[model samples]
Target: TLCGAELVDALQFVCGDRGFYFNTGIVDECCFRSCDLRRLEMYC
Candidate 1:
């Protein structure tokens, strides 16, 4: 999640009926354009 920045960075996710999740600390709570973002990730 973003603390304070301009060229922005954050955590945003959507969930389905199953109710499982991913934890970004800012989990499930949402944000704005306050508007949008895109990302790249790698998992080990």
Candidate 2:
């Protein structure tokens, strides 16, 4: 699991359905475990 700036780095390489989960919490103690929001893009 990644957090903070690293999470943003990972998002740069998002390949459509190749999903990854990352924390949006400011602190490790408050992770809500929410799913990542993604958009549909053309691969054809």
Candidate 3:
């Protein structure tokens, strides 16, 4: 369980799933968490 804003802030720097455009890639916390639990876990 992570805070959406915090996670977004972290990713905002890395531009992981945020897309090529910085602000354009902003994602909902639910989407980020789902991806984190699913795709991200597999890679780790």
**Residue 29 lDDT (model 2):** 23
Compared with the true structure, all predictions reach lDDT values of 0.28, 0.39, 0.44
Residues 1-44, candidate 2: write the lDDT tens digits: 45556555545655646454435233242223422433211210
lDDT of 3 by residue, 1-44 (tens): 44566555545544355353422122443354444644333222
Residue-pair clashes per candidate, as listed? Answer: 1, 0, 0
Could you say which candidate leads in lDDT?
3
State the local distance difference test value for candidate 3: 0.44
The residue ranges of model 3 lying beyond 4 angstroms of the native Cα positions read 16-44
Q: Give the TM-score of candidate 2.
A: 0.31
Query: What lDDT is obtained when candidate 2 is compared to the true structure?
Result: 0.39
Model 1 Cα lDDT, one tens digit per residue, 1-44: 33344222332133234343347422222232233333211110
Candidate 2 residue-pair clash tally:
0
Q: Residue 16 in model 2: shift from native, Å? A: 7.8
Residue pairs with clashing backbones, model 2: none
Off by over 4 Å in 2: 16-44
Q: Which candidate has the top score in TM-score?
A: 2
lDDT ranking from best candidate downward: 3, 2, 1
